[PDB]
Design a protein around this ligand. Structure first.
Ligand SMILES: N[C@@H](CCC(=O)O)C(=O)O
Ligand SMILES: N[C@@H](CCC(=O)O)C(=O)O
Ligand SMILES: N[C@@H](CCC(=O)O)C(=O)O
Ligand SMILES: N[C@@H](CCC(=O)O)C(=O)O
Lengths: 315, 313, 330, 330
């Protein structure tokens, strides 16, 4: 008796309803699982919204809770795949496999990667080995953690990378594992989608030579409840920007120091800025867009900067 | 006989210039070195005025017959931006090397001593002539054009998608690739003709992003905006209208990305650049693309010329 | 208060010395005693109660199986002591990976074991060993390191002793794993991101207490126009297993397959590894009919790693099916 | 209006076939002829005037020196023809990197030569060969490819044939260079970022037109507890050079040095490479006294690459100092 896998489609070039086309076009899935599909949205992923994430997250929770669902696959555009994957990893309190998957090459193109990617995603979602591992991403014959995998290379099929390595590989339908997650996720998370009805607004500003405070102030004036600073180096802040950040913090905007140095390492508390004195937070190893996701989720529960720091150290 | 190398210090934790030099007595074996303190900043705080001053000084020194090569000691946070700028604007074949250290020189196992030795070694080497600006960290010879700070904390921080061009070991340089892109002597740009740098700013793309940062940055003076998009410089549907509006208002729109380990942003792929009169940044990360756009806008505001530039440099 | 950490010195560049500070590459390995190595890092005393022993003083390219056993037995004796909280081995980098894996297989302890070396001698400008040794002692003293298997702490990284390997020459980032670092160590603090998945230490079926002498295992290389000569000669001179370092997915030339069949028939185990070592793994029954031939694939393990696992496994079994299970579990 | 490109087929996974679409890894190589390869990509007509020839039909792990010569001589004949603008070779991935370096050394032409394979057979879901082949033909037809040396065009990359290696098993990103890709090929279009520094093709001192049969060169591996047995056996059975695939910086065990000294004195060249293949290079006089012993270091070249260069080099010289020059220039 094969596993029952539900594919929740959101758009992207992997659809080459989109979900019906996939289920019709990859008849090999039937070898490895009983598939059914639902079109949760039809979007280019760069245009995803928080309302989209909530709808998706709620749906995945409903399915996870059903006795007739064994694993879930989410098909997605590649641009913000990493953000959805981390979101789900924080809010879905389930041990059932959840896999997110896309295609780097346009789905109808010569040698396009999506077909095998989707076959692998359904394989992984149907595998007992996937239970309790958090959200997974299955691109380039790899099993990557949805927490810290990122789109790192443009164009190429090897696009999705993590500083901490792949956890496994998927080959001819079989999963081979080499590492386990360390960080908090899914059933061991403090967050639960079932209790989240809205998400706070979080925005991201970049650091670079000759940067001013303008983007920071403007983003806050248009509703940001936290600012993810994408700094140079070790979350460094220009001396022209620090005063604004102090003022914004006082005004109640959380200040989270991430970086655009995203192949490896992490941002160290109290190294480049006096985070304790200013009541700021460091994003640890998390890239800016990952940091935004964590901040948003966390701020559904707490606005205590020390708790936020704990969170950024545990997830 | 030894090369005449000048060390231009600008700051960073590799750090005065006289201390740096005194800290590596071994420099004397490989070159005749002199020092000048151009500035003393944390490189995250660098300004365009600082870049202009450094660039002009490097050109003045490169014109001297008493100078064979130039090492610039720098904070690592915007090293990559400085190195690229110099690669664009200095029309000299003399070696120009930019160097820093990921650990403080007071730290255990600090990397700066040997970095600085190697920079001086590369700056004195005939093989370095005509190679464009070089960066010499982690025993590598990296191109200033496309090396970037990619790993935090670790001494292997500076990486290029196109690989190291060479290595430096026990003072000797070993080359394996050559640059392909326009630089230094073959640049159309010259610091000696630049007295002003146009304001260029950068905005980030992510889920649920709005047009707010872009509009605000333009309102506060940006002549070009570098879009650090998701994926292949992709732009949210919520942002496209503002970008069109800002282009008609005269702001150049340059599509870069935060996908920085390899590949490049393809024209007309994710957005209709010809129709909108936008530019793609090719392989250049956002902070690199800013540098190029600012230099290029000293000379042209033609988006087609700008695109050429982004495909040649 | 402070952890009691023992440093077992074995040689290497970390104990090396060059003629000048510029000699980061041309120098003499394995010159300095352990007490001198401890004295070069006064800061160790802040983070642990340390003491040293000189187990051996070798250039690691010249290590022997007897040296592995010696080291492995002393580590066991220390791990069984109430007075020892963690152990650091200083080692040459050339075969560091082989030793670290060996210890991960045979040391049935959850006490931290850390193997460390350096790419530059301590005499050199910007020498890396001071910080490497500090970080080693930090990791060895940290409760987070318990039950994690053998660790390697070079270049600010916590790597698994299983699958870290020397991958880059000259540079201080020399040690890499296909599956990533598991963590980092920065201002002596350990930050974890991944856990091991493979069997090690406490959960291993193997124990250095049982091993009296290791079986002879040798390695032969695959390349264009390769013949069966090296395989045959190595078996004629005592190899009980051959590790084939093939091209591609452990591929075997048609010129070589017949010899390997005959060797297997004559009781020599035949293990297919590769010289394609940045990622992936060797898949059973893909390039060659391993079930027909009664051969074993080395999975992700590089040739020199495969050799260590082969030797440890052959102390318990001569059944190729079991050997394959072992190559899939460890 | 279109460039004339000749495809020379030699076998490989690119020409392979498995039983079902999901057989991406377990299949038969070297089953399809060139005509069918070309038929599988009708889009080639858009970009070039292509003709195909079947040179051989092999799994590339079983390649011989005879086969390289045969291929190299056919490539030369085509290069000399006015009716040929560029050349593509389809090849198994396992020794692709050996062939591509060989060709880089011996083909005295600026006309583009591209070597290409695939990691999955054409029958597989998401098979990589079609686009690889398309992109090879595009690069072979591009004026920007002239004078660049032999190129390899897999995974949307333009890699130098000198120093690209098969580094990752299973995945389509198999081929890597320590020195980076030189460019990318996308929508048929080539995008260059680096140029070669090393000697190649028209600037080579070697020429396939002079080579009648290649010297025998073999490879032996370094690891813990290694002996001199492989080196001596290989030499006894005809090796005119030995490639030492050392640990670390081409390091040699003290149990092996005496045999290598004896062999060099008996006329066998001794080349120190390594199995540390992601970066760096082997430094002369560092780990061994090369000048004293009259040995050669392979610089950054991996063992199988060093074997190729040594074979070519030895068609011209037996002077170890000239061989060292060659290892420093090519
Ligand atoms: N921007 C598109 C690209 C196509 C794709 O990756 O699916 C997306 O993210 O939806
Ligand atoms: N943020 C400091 C760090 C110190 C350094 O890298 O030198 C700078 O870039 O100047
Ligand atoms: N080959 C020597 C020195 C190399 C090193 O330790 O880095 C050894 O492995 O002991
Ligand atoms: N081992 C075969 C198939 C592997 C491949 O081509 O990818 C060969 O090298 O010909």
């Amino acid at each position: 008796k094969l596993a029952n896998v539900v594919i929740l489609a959101t758009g992207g070039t992997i659809a080459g309803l989109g979900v019906d086309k996939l289920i019709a076009g990859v008849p090999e899935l039937a070898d490895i699982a009983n598939v059914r599909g639902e079109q949760v949205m039809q979007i280019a992923s760069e245009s995803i919204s928080n309302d989209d994430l909530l709808k998706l997250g709620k749906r995945v929770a409903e399915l996870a809770e059903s006795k007739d669902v064994d694993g879930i696959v989410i098909t997605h555009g590649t641009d913000t795949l990493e953000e959805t994957a981390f979101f789900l990893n924080l809010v879905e309190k389930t041990d059932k496999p959840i896999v997110v998957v896309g295609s780097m090459r346009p789905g109808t193109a010569m040698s396009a990667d999506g077909m095998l990617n989707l076959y692998n995603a359904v394989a992984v979602a149907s595998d007992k080995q996937s239970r309790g591992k958090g959200v997974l991403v299955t691109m380039n014959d790899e099993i990557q953690s949805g927490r810290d995998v990122s789109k790192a290379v443009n164009i190429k099929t090897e696009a999705f990378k993590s500083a901490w390595g792949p956890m496994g590989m998927v080959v001819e339908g079989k999963s081979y594992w080499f590492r386990l997650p360390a960080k908090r996720h899914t059933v061991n998370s403090e967050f639960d989608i079932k209790q989240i009805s809205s998400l706070p607004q979080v925005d991201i500003a970049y650091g670079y030579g000759n940067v001013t405070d303008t983007a920071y102030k403007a983003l806050a004036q248009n509703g940001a409840k936290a600012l993810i600073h994408a700094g140079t180096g070790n979350g460094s802040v220009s001396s022209r920007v620090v005063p604004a950040l102090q003022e914004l913090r006082k005004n109640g905007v959380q200040i989270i120091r991430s970086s655009h140095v995203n192949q490896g390492g992490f941002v160290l508390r109290n190294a480049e800025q006096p985070d304790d004195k200013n009541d700021w937070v460091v994003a640890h190893d998390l890239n800016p867009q990952k940091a935004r996701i964590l901040a948003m989720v966390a701020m559904t529960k707490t606005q205590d900067s020390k708790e936020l720091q704990r969170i950024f150290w545990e997830y």
